Design a protein around this ligand. Structure first.
Ligand code: HAS
Ligand code: HEM
Ligand code: CUA
Ligand SMILES: [Cu+]
Lengths: 552, 166, 33
């Protein structure tokens, strides 16, 4: 199963690495929820993990392993592996293993300084806060992994396109190609930041870095990167979930359209993270706020297409009136349940997001506990659930070890607990945010500073406990699936459960237009040049580098 | 059937789309509204104003805290604030209600938040740059300032005070 | 078969939850104006 599909192996190493990251990163979660419930569990944690020197070292670890490391590794797994099995083509395995070593070496390189308290700068690493050089080199090598991944999938696409002159790009491949193309355009920000600034800085080659350019370049990457976390989930939710649900994807071209739109509008909207910033024209902020509302469109589409598919699925399974279908879906199946719950939470989640994006409204909530509120419904829930669920079809496909009734049932617990835990925590944080509770703060070490957030603090406490269980159960579940010597090869040679796709007459012309990838890419690049071009030119004429500090 | 629900689903897909745009356009309008009133003062100035963070407390407007406040209109007061590793200068700030306060804020070390609890004042403070924001307190009393941008180990305790004289 | 009540429901909920959040935060913005 390795030697005609060694892409299976490679793929399996990316997942394991990602899920190991997630486990280590999450540990810090419950503690941080208690802290937001006004309880200080950090001596207890410090007694358990004697390297941990502060709340903020913990928070950095959390954000770096969970949000950057787990999520990229999961994307690299899904967004190479699915197009491979659909195409029935094998990725250039030389390059594949290169990208996996690059990420593992980059991860290890950067982990050392984090673990030694040399890089307590958080996953945004905003200069002048200045971490060890190995952090920036580590992170750089780790992110640059994705460039190899990009190549690999463009390769597969080119080769299929050669074997099938004339033919429209298969759907998952289409998705992965606009995905990887989008991510390339997106990553330029961070790469420029790293190459022009963070690296020379941390190597001692220069004494200062302009804070404002620093974060304007980061946010160039920093927004599309959450689409980079989302789409591998969306990939699975469009082309795999419907089949798990007992139905079909109700539209091929809506899915393409959506993914095209994200190619187009994910990058040029980063000032939405910079509304509170000096030295960026307010006009440019309005312009970026508009494009950010436009980027919300694909997920609005996605909500309909995905819900209709699930409805259809539910009707085929004998799904009664206005709500019967819901009950007729396979609530016995964690690969179905996990993403569906994800999607429910993604409703408040995106409403959160749309408020954030409306410029002046952002002054209400920016840097409050509301932001964490928002993005846990987004990545910690929808994405992470999706990843957790897919262990139930992906892992068996990769390894051949099938899933017991027991493990299926521990999964359901894990998934429901996590979901609920997250929902509770989302109320706490939003509420506390509304009460002006700042984010990124060890607030339990100042007991009397936030007396007015008495009750939502209770929720955060609750979610801390709830998600503690969820997480331990997940650790147990995961390893029990990976530490058995149950192997039936036959389902490791069974095909991915891709969905069938309802398709129509009008499709032909719409899909054709979308398949003009070279043109749409150029359009996307131009949209970046227009949106950041003018500002970047101005910043780069008036550079004011300032020296760095270490304040931990 | 099957094909029949295809047409129907694609239809209600243009409906939903067109509705979505229109509601998004309503937001755009209501936002453009807040841009046209007083409340838009909190929007940081866009024009670059460069200062040296290593000289900011020895020479110029941020050096002496006793000089912070300066009447600059018949109803306009510019307050020079400094946000630094682990508090605010001046402490408290002291300003009159019903006047337009033009905050001009910078940092001598790293990035800080400037969030005035109870208001729309919420602005990142960047070393090397001034954050200029305008506002008019209608209600007097003690407004608390919070740093909402992690600045290092004492970040959770970085607090200030505005005292708006009735 | 026919009209997708299910999704129409799902996006109805989705719509209302946006209006609650947005208008909600629009109100607080002005209260703090
Ligand atoms: C995966 C991770 C994330 C996703 C996805 C995401 C989506 C959005 N966000 Fe966000 N966000 C912002 C705006 C948006 C907008 C407009 C969207 C949109 O993309 C969201 C679109 C979503 C929808 C339009 C929802 C549609 C609903 C669907 C698709 C589900 C339907 C349910 C079904 C079908 C189930 C039915 C089944 C049944 C059985 C009933 C803004 C401002 O514009 C900020 C800065 C705030 C500040 O002040 O810093 C921000 C801050 C963040 C940060 C903080 C970064 C930091 O550390 O400072 C993170 C990590 C983050 C993550 C994510 N965010 N966001
Ligand atoms: C055990 C489950 C989790 C719990 C209990 C939890 C709890 C929290 C809390 C309370 C915060 C706020 C920290 C602060 O503002 O000081 C936070 C931050 C964060 N969480 Fe989680 N979280 C969990 C899992 C996840 C997952 C799975 C992800 C992404 C895959 C994630 C991504 C993040 C990120 C990026 C931050 C902020 C880092 C920063 O602001 O510097 N979390 N988490
Ligand atoms: Cu200054 Cu946080
Ligand atoms: Cu964003």
């Amino acid at each position: 199963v390795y030697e005609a599909y060694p892409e299976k192996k490679a793929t399996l190493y990316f997942l394991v690495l990602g899920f190991l990251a997630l486990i280590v990163g999450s540990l810090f979660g419950p503690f941080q929820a208690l802290n937001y419930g006004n309880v200080d569990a950090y001596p207890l944690l410090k007694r358990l993990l004697p390297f941990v020197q502060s709340y903020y070292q913990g928070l950095t670890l959390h954000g770096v392993l969970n949000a950057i490391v787990f999520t990229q590794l999961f994307a690299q797994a899904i967004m190479v592996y699915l197009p491979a099995r659909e195409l029935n083509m094998r990725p250039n395995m030389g390059l594949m293993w290169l990208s996996w070593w690059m990420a593992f070496i980059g991860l290890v390189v950067a982990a050392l300084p984090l673990l030694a308290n040399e890089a307590t700068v958080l996953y945004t690493f905003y200069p002048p806060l200045k971490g060890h050089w190995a952090f920036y080199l580590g992170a750089s090598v780790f992110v640059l992994s994705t460039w190899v991944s990009i190549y690999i999938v463009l390769d597969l696409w080119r080769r299929w396109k050669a074997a099938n002159p004339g033919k429209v790009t298969p759907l998952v491949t289409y998705m992965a190609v606009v995905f990887w193309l989008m991510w390339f355009l997106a990553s330029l920000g961070l790469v420029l930041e790293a190459v022009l600034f963070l690296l020379p800085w941390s190597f001692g080659l220069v004494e200062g870095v302009d804070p404002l350019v620093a974060r304007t370049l980061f946010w160039w990457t920093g927004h599309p990167i959450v689409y980079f976390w989302l789409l591998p989930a969306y990939a699975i939710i469009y082309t795999i979930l419907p089949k798990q649900a007992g139905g079909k994807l109700v539209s091929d071209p809506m899915a393409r359209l959506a993914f095209l739109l994200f190619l187009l509008l994910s990058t040029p909207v980063g000032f939405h993270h910079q509304f509170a910033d000096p030295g960026i024209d307010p006009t440019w902020k309005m312009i970026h706020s508009v494009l950010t509302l436009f980027v919300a469109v694909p997920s609005l589409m996605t909500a309909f297409t995905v819900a209709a598919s699930l409805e259809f699925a539910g009707r085929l399974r004998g799904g009664r009136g206005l709500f019967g279908w819901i009950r007729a879906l396979p609530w016995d199946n964690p690969a179905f349940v996990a993403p569906v719950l994800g999607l429910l939470g993604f409703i408040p989640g995106g409403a959160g997001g749309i408020v954030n994006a409306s410029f002046t409204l952002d002054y209400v909530v920016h840097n409050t506990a509301w932001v964490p509120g928002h993005f846990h419904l987004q990545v910690a829930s929808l994405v992470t659930l999706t990843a957790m669920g897919s262990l139930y079809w992906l892992l068996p496909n990769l390894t051949g070890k099938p899933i017991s009734d027991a493990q299926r049932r521990l999964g359901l617990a894990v998934v429901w607990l996590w979901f609920l835990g997250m929902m509770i925590m989302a109320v706490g944080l939003h509420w506390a945010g509304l009460l002006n509770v700042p984010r990124r703060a060890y607030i339990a070490q100042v007991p009397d500073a936030y007396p007015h957030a008495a009750v939502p603090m209770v929720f955060n406490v609750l979610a801390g406990i709830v998600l503690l269980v969820a997480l331990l159960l997940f650790i147990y579940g995961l390893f029990s699936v990976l530490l058995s010597r149950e192997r039936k090869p036959e389902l490791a040679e069974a095909p991915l459960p891709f969905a069938e796709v309802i398709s129509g007459p009008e499709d032909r012309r719409l899909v054709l237009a979308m398949d003009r990838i070279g043109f749409w890419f150029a359009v996307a690049a131009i949209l970046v040049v227009l949106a950041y071009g003018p500002t970047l030119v101005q910043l780069f004429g008036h550079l004011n580098p300032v020296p760095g500090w270490r304040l931990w | 059937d099957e094909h029949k629900a295809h047409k129907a689903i694609l239809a209600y897909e243009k409906g939903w789309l067109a509705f979505s745009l229109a509601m998004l356009f309503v937001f755009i309008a209501l936002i453009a509204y807040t841009l046209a009133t007083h409340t838009a003062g909190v929007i940081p100035a866009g024009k670059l104003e460069r200062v040296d963070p290593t000289t900011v407390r020895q020479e110029g407007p941020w050096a002496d805290p006793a000089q912070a406040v300066v009447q600059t209109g018949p109803n306009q007061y510019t307050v020079y604030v400094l946000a630094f590793a682990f508090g605010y200068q001046p402490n408290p700030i002291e300003v009159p209600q019903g006047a337009e306060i033009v905050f001009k804020i910078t940092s001598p070390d790293v990035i800080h938040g400037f969030h005035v609890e109870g208001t729309n004042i919420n602005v990142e403070v960047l070393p090397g740059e001034v954050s200029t924001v305008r506002y008019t307190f209608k209600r007097p009393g003690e407004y608390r300032i919070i740093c909402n941008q992690y600045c290092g180990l004492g970040h959770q305790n970085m607090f200030g005070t505005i005292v708006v004289k009735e | 078969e026919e009209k997708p009540k299910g999704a129409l429901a799902v996006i109805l909920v989705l719509t209302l939850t946006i209006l609650v959040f947005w208008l909600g935060v629009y109100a607080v913005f002005f209260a703090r104006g």
